[PDB]
């Protein structure tokens, strides 16, 4: 049935029908346009009129322009043929390599896995990063969250994890470019063709790309997160594979929602956000999980507005994550990379039953002396180090060496840093920090611990510095 | 030893006051940022309330 456009204000568009009014979530094809425009139905205003959200620019639309109903939501291609192809929010290919030929399709909207379908097995995931594995270690088939402000190091950290974990893993992967730099999409695309994880000629690709970047309108950026999510669901359910989902950045899903909620005629919530901030995220985040049949290990980059973690958008996501990685600016500005905050990052698998009693005891020891070091900052600021007690000097000394030993050269950072990237095993990490806490390297300087792999290379670096006479 | 400690305490307390002055300056900026944010946020609640009537 045909429908007439009655109102157009930004991304939101109102379409009226005579008979056959389309339900909520259904996609609508706007006729008389050069490129394929898509309107998703959001509300039913009354008087046979429905409010919609446009998946592309609404410029050029005239009132009374005909709009056809597809009879379903935004349906997209899903399968082995999506691997090595770049998709947009409405399923179309944006890599100039013809159509994505598949024998089945799937709608972007779907109900989350039921309570009986949930999984229980919580196994540890070894990254290689020292600050991560010791304090807030990730889990296989879990939900990892990389919090960080503007330019702290989320896109570097996520690319390190893709370089290490997604390379050495017998299974498929998915990358969702949600509201970030299109330049970074081009860099990632060619870097993966170079490595071999994506292949143009062969059909042996491991990664599936979906992109709706910051040049796209709010309708696309609000729904492209679900588009890439739906690709991972196929491999989980119908195949039963171990999938790796990489969303950068998940904040843009919520931010895009805030831009349309104004135009949808809702009363705004705290800090100008939408009132449906938790529920819209809830229905989305709950789909990203490990079911009984398949499994998904999601690593989501999370932006933090104005370095404020109390902001609604990042504050809500914490509950949906198993392991958190709070990247601080103060830590980054000191030179400590990756700038993971050791008294903020947390994990649910951090338990003596899971990681072991030696892991848990050494984990709390690092956080204890770091907390004691932070507690004496007001005393060192005004009075000084001389005013501190003799035994307190020892606790401040080790904490700074522990802070610098938490830093680590990255593999992907080689291009600009210069230093070669390190990959420290789990057992060597626990051993290294335990020796510093026990006081086996109190004679060595601090700068020896700055940017090294295991503890062995820290001692060797001190001997190199010993040769400045 | 008497003249040594008085010269050292002079500079020690001089540094303490100058280090305190720097912390006051930065906290005064953080105070004024948070001052404005509270004024703006509280006002948006009142505008949000009036519009819903």
């Amino acid at each position: 049935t045909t429908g007439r456009i009655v109102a157009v204000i930004g991304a939101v568009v109102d379409v009226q029908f005579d008979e056959g009014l389309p339900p909520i979530l259904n996609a609508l094809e706007v006729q008389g346009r050069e490129t394929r425009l898509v309107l998703e139905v959001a509300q039913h205003l009354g008087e046979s009129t429905v409010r919609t959200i446009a998946m592309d620019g609404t410029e050029g639309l005239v009132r009374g322009q005909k709009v056809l109903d597809s009879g379903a939501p935004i349906r997209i291609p899903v399968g082995p043929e999506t691997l090595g192809r770049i998709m947009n929010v409405i399923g179309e290919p944006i890599d100039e390599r013809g159509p994505i030929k598949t024998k089945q399709f799937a709608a972007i909207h779907a109900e989350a896995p039921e309570f009986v379908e949930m999984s229980v097995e919580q196994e540890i995931l070894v990254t290689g990063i020292k600050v991560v594995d010791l304090l807030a270690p990730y889990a296989k088939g879990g939900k990892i969250g990389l919090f960080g402000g503007a330019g702290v190091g989320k896109t570097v950290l996520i690319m390190e994890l893709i370089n290490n974990v997604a390379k050495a893993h017998g299974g498929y992967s998915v990358f969702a470019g949600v509201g970030e730099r299109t330049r970074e999409g081009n860099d990632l695309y060619h870097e993966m063709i170079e490595s071999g994880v994506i292949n143009l000629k062969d059909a042996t690709s491991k990664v599936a790309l979906v992109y709706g970047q910051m040049n796209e309108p709010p309708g696309a950026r609000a729904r492209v997160a679900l588009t890439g999510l739906t690709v991972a669901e196929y491999f989980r359910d119908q195949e039963g594979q171990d999938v790796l989902l990489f969303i950068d950045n998940i904040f843009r899903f919520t931010q895009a929602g805030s831009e349309v909620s104004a135009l949808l005629g809702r009363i705004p919530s705290a800090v100008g956000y939408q009132p449906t901030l938790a529920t819209d995220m809830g229905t989305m985040q709950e789909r990203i999980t490990t079911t009984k049949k398949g499994s998904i290990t999601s690593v989501q980059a999370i932006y933090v507005p104005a370095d404020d973690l109390t902001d609604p958008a990042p504050a809500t996501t914490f509950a949906h994550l198993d392991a958190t990685t709070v990247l601080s600016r103060a830590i980054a500005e000191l030179g400590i990379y990756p700038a993971v905050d050791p008294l903020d990052s947390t994990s649910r698998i951090m338990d003596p039953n899971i990681v072991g009693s030696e892991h848990y005891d050494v984990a709390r020891g690092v956080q204890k002396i770091l907390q004691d070091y932070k507690s004496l900052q007001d005393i060192i600021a005004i009075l000084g180090m001389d005013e501190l007690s003799e035994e307190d000097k020892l606790t401040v000394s080790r904490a700074r060496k522990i802070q610098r030993f938490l830093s680590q050269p990255f593999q992907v950072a080689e291009v600009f840093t210069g230093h070669l990237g390190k990959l420290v095993p789990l057992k060597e990490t626990i051993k290294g920090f335990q020796q510093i806490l026990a006081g086996e390297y109190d004679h060595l300087p601090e700068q020896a611990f700055y940017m090294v792999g295991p503890i062995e290379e820290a001692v060797a670096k001190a001997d190199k510095l010993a040769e400045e006479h | 030893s008497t003249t040594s400690e008085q010269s050292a305490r002079m500079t020690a307390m001089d540094n303490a006051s100058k280090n305190a002055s720097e912390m006051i300056d930065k906290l005064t900026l953080t105070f004024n940022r948070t001052r404005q944010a509270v004024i703006t946020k509280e006002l948006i609640e009142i505008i949000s309330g009036a519009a819903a009537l």
């Binding site: 900052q377 060192i380 600021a381 000084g384 180090m385 000394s397 700074r400 004679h443 060595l444 300087p445 601090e446 700068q447 001190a462 001997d463 510095l465 010993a466 040769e467 400045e468 006479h469 | 540094n15 100058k18 280090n19 305190a20 720097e22 912390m23 930065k26």
Partner: peptide
């Protein structure tokens, strides 16, 4: 405070120099 970091880094740079002196003389 910035001068907190100034005094602390100064102290531990001096003590780092002392530790490198003991380390080099022990190395000989």
């Amino acid at each position: 405070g910035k001068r907190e970091q100034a005094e602390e880094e100064r102290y531990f740079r001096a003590r780092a120099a002392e530790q490198l002196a003991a380390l080099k003389k022990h190395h000989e």
